[PDB]
Structure formats: C-alpha cells, structure tokens
Design a protein around this nucleic acid. Structure first.
Ligand SMILES: [K+]
Ligand SMILES: [K+]
Ligand SMILES: [K+]
Ligand SMILES: [Mg+2]
Ligand SMILES: [Mg+2]
Ligand SMILES: [Mg+2]
Ligand SMILES: [Mg+2]
Ligand SMILES: [Mg+2]
Ligand SMILES: [Mg+2]
Ligand SMILES: [Mg+2]
Ligand SMILES: [Mg+2]
Ligand SMILES: [Mg+2]
Ligand SMILES: [Mg+2]
Ligand SMILES: [Mg+2]
Ligand SMILES: [Mg+2]
Ligand SMILES: [Mg+2]
Ligand SMILES: [Mg+2]
Ligand SMILES: [Mg+2]
Ligand SMILES: [Mg+2]
Ligand SMILES: [Mg+2]
Ligand SMILES: [Mg+2]
Ligand SMILES: [Mg+2]
Ligand SMILES: [Mg+2]
Ligand SMILES: [Mg+2]
Ligand SMILES: [Mg+2]
Ligand SMILES: [Mg+2]
Ligand SMILES: [Mg+2]
Ligand code: NA
Ligand code: NA
Ligand code: NA
Ligand code: NA
Ligand code: NA
Ligand code: NA
Lengths: 152, 136, 53, 105
RNA sequence: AGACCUGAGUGUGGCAGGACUACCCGCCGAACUUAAGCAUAUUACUCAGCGGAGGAAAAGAAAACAACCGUGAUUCUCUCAGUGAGCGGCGAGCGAAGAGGGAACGAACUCGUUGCCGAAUCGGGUCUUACAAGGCCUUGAGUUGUGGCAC
RNA sequence: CAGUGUCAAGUUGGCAGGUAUUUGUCUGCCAAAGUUAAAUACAGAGUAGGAAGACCGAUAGCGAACAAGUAGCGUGAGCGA
RNA sequence: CACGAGUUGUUCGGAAACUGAGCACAACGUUAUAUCGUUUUGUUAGGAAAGUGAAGGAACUGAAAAGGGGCAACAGAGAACCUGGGAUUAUAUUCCAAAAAGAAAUUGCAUGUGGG
RNA sequence: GAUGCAUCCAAGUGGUGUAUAUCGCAAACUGAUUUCUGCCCAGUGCUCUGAAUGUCAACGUGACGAGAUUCACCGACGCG
RNA sequence: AAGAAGACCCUGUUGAGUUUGACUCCAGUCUGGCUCUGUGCGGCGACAUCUGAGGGUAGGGUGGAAGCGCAAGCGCAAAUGAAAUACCACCACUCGGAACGUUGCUUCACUUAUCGAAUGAAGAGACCAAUGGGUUGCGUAGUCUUCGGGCUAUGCACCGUCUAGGUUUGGGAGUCCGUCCCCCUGUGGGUACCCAACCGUGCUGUACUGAACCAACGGGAUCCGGAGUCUUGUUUCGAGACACUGCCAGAUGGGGAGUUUGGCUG
RNA sequence: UUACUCUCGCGUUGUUCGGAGCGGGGGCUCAAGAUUGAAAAAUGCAUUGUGAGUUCUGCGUUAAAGCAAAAACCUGGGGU
RNA sequence: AAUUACCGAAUCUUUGAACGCAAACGGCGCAUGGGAGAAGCUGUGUCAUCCCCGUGCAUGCCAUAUUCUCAGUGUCGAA
RNA sequence: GCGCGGACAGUAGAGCAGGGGAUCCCCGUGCUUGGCGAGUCCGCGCACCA
C-alpha cells in the first residue's frame, strides 16, 4: 500500500508475513496495477501474466530479481544439462514414454513407437493414467495470441 | 467412521467378494476399542468399565474406569478385590467388559444367541469336530 | 502452557455463545452483602468436626 | 459438572423453598469447614437467628424466588469482546452521517 | 494474605513392558481347493497376521424355554439330526434349537437405584507379642458421597 | 454384530413368543454394572511323579537309540545330516 | 600334523571428544494391531523437557541463557615422539635402566623461587 | 499463482517435486544445425456453455392407506 | 549315437505377462445431501389464520331459501347452456395485503467453530468512548411482584485515562538578547520555557559496510518512574460459518483386481 | 610524489598494474627456505659441489558446475 | 567321604524385557558410600590429581507427602 | 421395462411443391381410439437374476 502504482517489485508476499513467495526466479518481477484504499487490497500483475489481489499490508522488495537473461544461452551439451541438474534433483535425462514398455507406461509398446490413443487425458484420471497432456483445453501449434495459462 | 481396509494402494486380491476397501466395518465397537487403548497404554491398571460422554463429527469420547490392583483399599474391599486376581489382567483385551460382551453378541440368550455361546469358537468347536465313540 | 490457554479460551467461548436460561441463571448470583450474611449464618451452624462428634 | 445442581433451582421453585445462587463453592466449603460444597440447606436455627433467617429469606426471595418468570425466560451470552465492541463503535462513527442526504426533510 | 481447582516438579512406596502360547479369549483374515469351466457359494467365520489370560479359559443366575399335567443359572455327553427344520447359481453343498436320558451341583452372591440414616468409611502414624477386619490420634482422602440397614 | 444418521418408553411400561403391517388378546421374562466351584479342552505347551501298548525295531520309529537342532550349508530369513 | 611358544604404547589407530549424507529414542499423532509416521529448510513435542556461575549467613540455596537425548567418518575434522640399539626363534616410533643409548613434547594436580 | 498443479501413504496437525515460486515446478511429444512443417474438428479423445429449458441418486416435500407401502413433486455433476 | 519328459504344431473345460470401446468389480477424481455449524439485519417464497376482489360457445359452481327486503328485483315464467341469477345465504382459480409463529432457500454485516499462513506465539485493541458492561448506583414512564424488588424504554452517572509531533490560546523568570570564568580576542560551560485547545495516533532515526547489552538520572521509605494505563480475556495476520470432518448417494474410472474368450473340423 | 607529457612507467612464461598512489630511497611485517650453534659422537657404516625428476610449498580456466560442516582453539570490542 | 539321593541356608561372571548414557567401544557419566594411595608431615598415620569397588539414577502409570515446592489476564476472596 | 420430447405451430393456422397478372400478392396444401383418459413409429437419458 506504500508503493506507487506502476512500480516494479519482486519478493512479493502473497500473505502479510509470508516473507516473500511471488516473483523470485531470476529476472522476474511483479507490476503494481492499483490500490483499493477501502478494501485495503492491492492488485498486481504476476510474471505468468495473471492479475492477483493481495492485502495492502503485504510487503514487496523494490526492483527485479537479479540473474535475468539466463535461459537465453543455449546449453549445447548433455554434460551442461548434467551439471545444471546436479544441484537440483534427480530428474534428468528424460526417457520418452513411447520408448518404454507397456508394463511401466500407458504409452509403452507397439511394433512402432506410437501413442495408440489420444494423449489428452481427463482431469479426473487416476495417478498412473494421468500422463500425456493433462486436461488440455487445446493442443497443436499456438497461432496468434498466447492465452494466459493457468486457472481462471 | 468406517474402517478402511489397510491394503496397499487399496488393491485386493482373490475373489471379488473380498475386494471392498471403504465399506467394511470393524467387528468391534468403538467403546471396546477405547477400553483396549486405555488398557494397553497403562498395564499397571485394571480396566473395569466405560461410558459415553460426548462426540464430535470426528471424535468420540469414552471415560474408562480403572482400578489399581496394588492399592490396599482395593485389596481389602470384598466388593472390588475380585479384580486383583490375575485372571482379570487385561480383561478388556479379551472382550470381557460390557462393551466386549456387547459386540460378542452376549446381550442375547436362547434362540437369538445359540451359535455364539459360550463363544463363536466354542460353538464352532462342538458343532464341527468329528466324534469317534469307542463302540460305534 | 496449553492448559492456561484452554481455560482462558473456555471463558471466552462461554461468553460468546447463546447461553440458555437454565445455565444462564447461574451467572445471576446473590449480592455481596446478602452472600456474606448467609455465609456467616451457615458458619454459625456448621457440622461437628470428627473430634467434636 | 454443572449437571449436579443445574436442576436444583427448579426443584426449589417447585416446592416453594427459598434459594440463593452464590459465588464460589469453595467459600461454601469454607463455611462448613470443608474444601468445597455444592449446596447447603438450613433446616432450623435458634431463636437468636430467626430474625436474621427471615431477613435473609426476604432478600434471597427478591433476587431469586419472586423473579421466576424472568429467570425462566432469560437467555444469556451473545457478548462481544472489547476489540469487537470498539470496532463497531468506530465503524458507526465513521459512517455517522453517510445517508443524511437520503432523507427527504 | 489466603482458598479451591485445573495442571506441573521432586521425594517416598509400588506396578507394566519380556518369556510361554498345546488348549482358551478378542480382533484380523486368505488362497489352493470343490462346483468336472466360473464370478455367488465352497474351502472357512479355517491357515497365515495382531493382541490377552489361566490351570483351564470362556460361560453363568433368565428382558430363558415353551404353549405343556408344564420346565427353570452356566458348561458338557448321548440324542434331537445330515434333519419330510431351514440356507443354497434351491447347484455343488451347507445346517442348528427346544424337549428326553445323563455328568456336575451344599450354588449362589455384589453394586447402582429406591428409602431410612449420614463419615458410622478409607489411608497414615502409633499402642496392644499385632504394616490386627482392634483401640488412640490424624485434614490427609472423602459430603461432586464412603459406609450401614431393609425388602 | 459394526459404522453413520436418527433416537424411546416407563411397569395405564418394556423385551421375547422363527412371514412384513395395523389392531387386541394371551404367555414368559425384566436388557442396557459386576463376581462365581464343578462337570468340558489341552488338535506340535510346560513342572513333579506314575501306568501301559495285538505299535516301530537302526534306510524303521521323532530330524535326533550316538558330544543332534549337533557337524555342515546360506549375506539372511532359514536349511539340516 | 604334534608339542611348546609369540602380539609390550602418556605421544601410533580407535574411544574418551567433532560435524556429514543419514538414523530414530523420547514426545506426540495414527493404527483392531506399533513391529507405523513425523523427527536439520535452526532443529522434538499444544510445547511448563534448562537443576546450576554467583552470592549470602562447607555444601545448602538461586539470576540469564528459546528450540529434549543419542548415534552415524579406523581415508573428512582432530591427534603431545623420534632417532640409535650387538634388541627376539617370533613384537617393536610399543622393548632398552641411572651414563635409562638417549634426546624431547604434552596433560592433571601439588611444592618452592621470584614478582610489581 | 500455493487453501495450487503433479503426487506418496492403511491412517494422522503425515509425505515428495518444494531450502522452491512461472527465467519455477510437474506431464507429454519430437530429436543438432539448415530449410520447412500443407489440407481435415465428420469420428474418438480432451476442453468450455455464466442455457445446461430432456434424463437421473438419495436427501427432502406433499397426497392415498389402519399401516407396511404406493404415487406425485424436487433433485447435482455427468450424458444429451 | 550323447546331451533336454520338442521351445514348433495340436489338445486340456491348465497357466502367466500384456491390451481393450470383453464380463464382473475396486481405489482415485468429481458431484449432491446431511453433519461439522454460531450471531444479528434484510429478501423471496411455503405453511396456518383474517380476509380481498373479480369472474365449447356464451347468456362456473353447489345447494337450502318463491318472497321479503329501507329501497324493490330476481321467477316457478323473457334471453343460454355440454349449466337460468332471487330477499338471508352460495363460491371455481388466480391476484392482492399484513401480524403475528416456523422456515425452506438466500443477500449483507459479524465472530466464537473451523480452515490457511507467520512467529523464539516480541509489543493486539482501547483510552480518540457506544446501537457497550455492571447490584461483586440514581432518577423518570409504564408493566409486574412472592412486597423483598424486578422487567421493558428512558436519561444522568461509574467502568474511563495518558501521549511524540503539527497548529494556536494564557503564565513570568531567570542569566534568544544576553550570561558565568579564564586569556581588545580566543576558548570553555549552560538556559533560551510552562500550561490550555483542535489535528494526529502511540509516532526520538532515513529519504558504497561504525558503536549501541548487564541503565544512568529523578522521587518515596528498598520500592517507585525512567520504560503511560487498561483487558466483556482471543499470540498475530487472512478467511469464516463456507470451505474442513464423518456418513449416505450418483457419475466417472485398464490406474488396478478377478475371470472368460464354445464345439465340429481329412 | 611535474608519476601520465602526447611514444607514461613497472613487471610476468602467462591473461597485468598505478593519483582509489606507479617507480626510486629508507623501513615494518608474514611465508618459505638459508646460516650458527645445542642435540652429536658418546651414534651410524666400512663428501662438497653441479645438472635432471619430484607438487611440501610459493605464486594468495568449464560453470545455467562457483566447488561441506562442527568441535576445539585464537584474537578483539565492552566490563571487572 | 571328591560316595550317592534329596532339600529348606548360600553363592550365582558379561548380557538379555534390560531400565544412568552408549555400543562391531569389555566405553563414558551424575549423586552418594567406601578402598588403595606417591611426595611433603610426626616407621606411622593424612592425602591432591589418577585408579578400583558398592549403591541409586529409563519411560509410563497408581498411591502418597505426619501435610513438600510451585504455575494459571481459571473461579473467588481478604482486612 | 421407466419416463420424456416429435409425428411446422396448434385451440386446424404456418412454411411451400403446382397455379394470373406485373421478387410482391392471390388458389391450395395439410399419428390413432374414447368423455380432456387409453395404443403406433423416431429419437434421448435411464432398468436389466428365468
Ligand atoms: K477338475
Ligand atoms: K436333563
Ligand atoms: K538289525
Ligand atoms: Mg524397447
Ligand atoms: Mg498399460
Ligand atoms: Mg504404444
Ligand atoms: Mg519415431
Ligand atoms: Mg512416434
Ligand atoms: Mg479360494
Ligand atoms: Mg487342500
Ligand atoms: Mg480354473
Ligand atoms: Mg492364526
Ligand atoms: Mg472360568
Ligand atoms: Mg468374570
Ligand atoms: Mg544306520
Ligand atoms: Mg533314523
Ligand atoms: Mg595345524
Ligand atoms: Mg544430520
Ligand atoms: Mg560419532
Ligand atoms: Mg593417537
Ligand atoms: Mg533431424
Ligand atoms: Mg513331451
Ligand atoms: Mg489366465
Ligand atoms: Mg509370465
Ligand atoms: Mg486385467
Ligand atoms: Mg476344437
Ligand atoms: Mg533401551
Ligand atoms: Na492407457
Ligand atoms: Na508381557
Ligand atoms: Na500363566
Ligand atoms: Na450399529
Ligand atoms: Na482473528
Ligand atoms: Na479400469
């Protein structure tokens, strides 16, 4: 509430006392859209493009998160991906589901590598069946305006 | 609530008759369960009885009555010193309190309880064992 | 400690809810002076102790 | 538990026995020389205290026996904290005359 | 000041965990198998699993049977009875009870309530040759009720 | 019998009386605290004593008539002469 | 195979006595069942888990200090000794005897000399 | 966009990606550059519609009946 | 020739792995209801009761009552119909209102259940004052009384009270002005304010690496304030009686389980 | 310290450095080594110079990779 | 009686439910009783550090305190 | 098997195949049985023990 509209902020508290949960990845920030002095709420634009309102008591850091521009440099090498994920978690390399056998994946098997059924699966699919394009509203190459992702 | 069958990932095996996970009910009542938890936790006491006091949507509260079998007041009382004798150790674990008798079917007598007296196993034993008379 | 918080919150919750008359009547005590006088009269006529009996 | 004596004022009222609800079962226990006491009944006193007993009966009846309709009718509780009452006060003060122009006169 | 009443600390006195587990008591709980297949059924309220006690356990003094000229706590035996009971893809299969002859049997008691009392109760010290079912003392516990008496 | 919901009556009363219901008769009994010996079990138990057998007779009979749950095997659970 | 021997430490390695990936006693919760779960992202547990520096008239009393007790490295951290021996059948930076072959370092207590 | 998505667990004030926060995380497909990636939404999926103007569950509501019950009405996702 | 009870092929009322839009199901997901679950204001309806107010072609019934009604009209007689109206009495179905009780949904305002975060539960709110609280008061007007005093409105009072800073109303008293020493000069030490009002809300700092703890100081007989006080009490913040707990119900559901997938046959 | 006035200077094998103080003179300090002696000849066996290897040590690029922690110990800042 | 048999008295190492804390450690503590004890002191006693032995010390629960010590914006209440 | 909507809108009109004059108007054309209850075909969504 003490920050002028149009100011660029990062490390934004979703709830007062959160100690910062929004706009923390390198290069990311929020934009303050407006204040509602009656309700005591501030409306802001998140990096994803969604607009969210939080109590005006939530704290923000002035500026943008450092380290921006990282994803612009091609990795070029499997070894560079290896070192990138070394400090994160065991999630790489990635084996395609159609390269697996039907015992361990719905996409497995066949005498050609193929998904034999539509890869868009329901939101209600149980774990083990919910693989592929999960509850996709649309598929294929996005033409024209990219719609803001996430829920409504 | 009802008992959830503790199978991995809710998966059962064998005949479809045994495939239920969420709809089975524990064959003991909750009062007997509360008495058993009290008795297991404090093995130096003798559980005597219990009664309902309150319940929530999540919880049920039962007050359990327990006796210290080493207290001289208990040991010299002809009304309660029966429980000092070691045959009454953990009687709630064996379904011997009022709640245990209730879920054993022992509130009934005669033709409503013939297959469960003096116990289900006792009646099964005397109904299913092959008798070989000496001269037959 | 948990019990301190619980007794305080119990007083709060007893005040915040709608107390039916059968329970509410016990907050409508006798006045101070009559209470002292009645307590003194009862103290006059207390039972015998163990040794007096 | 309050259920031990929750019925006692009603039983006293039904039999037309003067009763008082007083503070602190521990003070009652102090009177009879005990730790606590739920209730005490006076059956008779000597002549030196007949007048005191009668005056006590009168004031006790004023508070309790004569007020049976109110006592039977009166719901309690519904009390706000100090912070809530002050907040309602401040709100009524802020919106003290917002609708003054809506009035025809 | 202090009280009680809710909860802690320490001292003192004690108890539980483990083992056994044939039989017994409480839960939990299959599948092979049989149905000439198989899913209900069957195997089986069994095995495996988790708890608990004893010298036996459990049961047990009618909210019982009967429908009689009536019986009379429990348990067990023969029998009722593989049943002109019943259950059952009414298939495979399953499946008791009362009465009757018997074993046992000194088998009966307690509380709570009611109503008449109301600390007469308990524990602890200490005397009696005595951690007395005794005397004395004792606020310690108990009147938010222990103990007596009665159908 | 169990979970959950819902929940009495008061002996002008309840429960039972093996085809659901509503009536009105009859009969038996009085649930929702508790203790209790014997007659029964010991279907892979123990302690101290006993008695036997139309049983087996060292590849049999317990795995074990013997320094046998031993020697040996297995990472181990166990296996086991 | 039989008989009889052989491994010597203030300092070497470990432990007393560190933290790591981790483990899981307590506590609490769950489960018909604890033989289940949580238990280092500063950190147990609705959670009152600290028991003694001081003083003050020899052991009795008590301030402030937030987040219980352990374990997990014989290659990480750490750790005061090293040469000579004609000293063995076999041990040795471990044994050697007042000329300790000898030379050191380092703990813990005590005794003196001296202090400014 | 975190009272989230994916997701472990028989269960809990339980667990993982998350010591994170869209330049993040999770789920697929293709397989370096280069040059390109056409047409088809009928089918089956997936998705949305802030009509869901038909269809249902039990929960309710009413009526008939001495009552057990019978009928009627309401009834959400979803399907259409 | 040996090595292995053919692995090919068939048969069996033998399997197992895998698939699915096979049969029969189960977790998971979603959805409805009840529950958790409290307060107060309103809104739309429903129920009970008073009561409007009209009225297949047209001139709704259905009955007593063919005569009186102040007046004087309706026929048993004129007009119809798939039905012919009197004076007392006689309403179909809709529409309309309270004024009470209950309440099914629902808007809003709440806050104590509950949910979500944070924190070493580290400073909440008020004093700025009610549509507040109380015999641990005082009146008034009704209305009751067990005669002691209540209840409902109404007012007065008590609970109940202090502030950085900003702006302006009154007070003198020491010496900006100047003063009190030492060396025209230089330097060193201090005060140059208090009260009251409105605002404000608990406020001594600001608009590329410092130090800060175990107060001094001032009063009263060691306490006190310095360092305000208070508590119808919630650690604080955000939601909030829904979205979270249990039960019941429907759909979905190869993610998973079980099982089946005839026979004859050159 | 007119050091850098229009070719600044110093220095590495090597990627530098300097008015935020180069270079020269004179000093302070740390780390590696030297040299002298005590040990020590009383021991050991039957000698004092150079060149090549050798990582103790000194010199304090890949990275969307930036390369543990604690005990113990050390010193100061405050106070006695 | 190194006989046997039986049984009342005794002994009974390290562990193990194992329970002061640990553990591929014959490890390490706190409290409390003891033992031994060099150098100094008048052979004797005494004895710091070190060393040895006994006892108690897990968690929970019950009872209890000749009436122990406390906590709570729980409820009261002093005179 | 149960319920719905429909045999274009209905309480017999509308769309429009074929008709006169200059795309306009006008002729035509059109689910059963009973005094508003009981059957036939399409679909939908739902039930499935000979
Ligand atoms: K067969
Ligand atoms: K008999
Ligand atoms: K032989
Ligand atoms: Mg492959
Ligand atoms: Mg698959
Ligand atoms: Mg495939
Ligand atoms: Mg391919
Ligand atoms: Mg492909
Ligand atoms: Mg089977
Ligand atoms: Mg078999
Ligand atoms: Mg088969
Ligand atoms: Mg078993
Ligand atoms: Mg028995
Ligand atoms: Mg018994
Ligand atoms: Mg042989
Ligand atoms: Mg043999
Ligand atoms: Mg050898
Ligand atoms: Mg760790
Ligand atoms: Mg360690
Ligand atoms: Mg060492
Ligand atoms: Mg290519
Ligand atoms: Mg063959
Ligand atoms: Mg198969
Ligand atoms: Mg296979
Ligand atoms: Mg399958
Ligand atoms: Mg064939
Ligand atoms: Mg242990
Ligand atoms: Na699939
Ligand atoms: Na045990
Ligand atoms: Na035993
Ligand atoms: Na039930
Ligand atoms: Na709050
Ligand atoms: Na499936």
């Amino acid at each position: 509430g003490q920050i002028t509209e149009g100011c660029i902020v990062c490390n934004v508290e979703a709830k007062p006392g959160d100690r910062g949960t929004l706009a923390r990845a390198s290069g990311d920030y929020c934009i303050i859209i407006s204040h509602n002095h009656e309700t005591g709420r501030t409306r802001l634009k998140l990096p994803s493009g969604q607009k969210k309102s939080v109590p005006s008591t939530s704290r923000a850091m002035i500026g943008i998160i450092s380290g921006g521009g990282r994803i612009e440099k091609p990795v070029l090498k499997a070894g560079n991906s290896f070192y990138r994920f070394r400090g994160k978690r065991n999630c790489w390399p990635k084996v395609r589901g159609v390269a697996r056998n039907p015992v361990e994946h719905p996409h497995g098997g066949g005498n050609h590598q193929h998904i034999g059924h539509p890869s868009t699966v329901s939101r209600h699919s149980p774990p083990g069946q919910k693989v592929g394009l999960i509850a996709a509203r649309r598929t294929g190459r996005i033409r024209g305006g990219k719609a803001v992702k996430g829920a409504w | 609530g009802g008992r959830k069958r503790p199978v991995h990932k809710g998966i059962t095996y064998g005949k479809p008759k045994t495939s239920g996970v969420l709809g089975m009910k524990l064959n003991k009542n909750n009062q007997a369960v509360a008495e058993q938890r009290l008795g297991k936790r404090f093995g130096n006491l003798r559980v005597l009885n219990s009664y309902w006091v309150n319940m929530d949507s999540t919880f049920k509260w039962y007050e359990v009555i327990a006796v210290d079998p080493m207290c001289k007041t208990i040991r010299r009382d002809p009304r309660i010193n029966w429980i000092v004798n070691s045959v009454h150790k953990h009687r709630e674990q064996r379904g011997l309190t009022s709640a245990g008798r209730k879920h054993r079917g022992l509130r009934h007598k005669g033709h409503k309880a013939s297959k469960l007296r003096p116990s289900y196993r006792a009646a099964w034993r005397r109904n299913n064992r092959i008798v070989f008379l000496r001269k037959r | 400690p948990t019990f301190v918080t619980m007794q305080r919150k119990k007083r709060v919750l007893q005040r915040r809810l709608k107390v039916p008359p059968a329970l509410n009547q016990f907050t409508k005590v006798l006045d101070r002076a009559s209470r002292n006088e009645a307590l003194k009269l009862i103290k006059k006529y207390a039972p015998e102790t163990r040794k007096a009996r | 538990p309050v259920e031990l004596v929750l019925w006692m004022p009603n039983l006293c009222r039904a039999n037309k026995i003067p009763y008082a609800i007083v503070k602190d079962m521990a003070r009652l226990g102090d009177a009879i020389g005990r730790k606590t006491a739920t209730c005490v009944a006076l059956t008779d006193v000597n002549a030196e205290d007949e007048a005191t007993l009668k005056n006590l009966i009168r004031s006790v009846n004023a508070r309790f026996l004569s007020r049976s309709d109110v006592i039977r009718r009166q719901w309690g509780g519904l009390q706000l904290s100090l912070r809530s009452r002050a907040e309602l006060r401040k709100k009524h003060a802020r919106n003290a005359g917002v609708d003054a122009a809506a009035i025809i006169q």
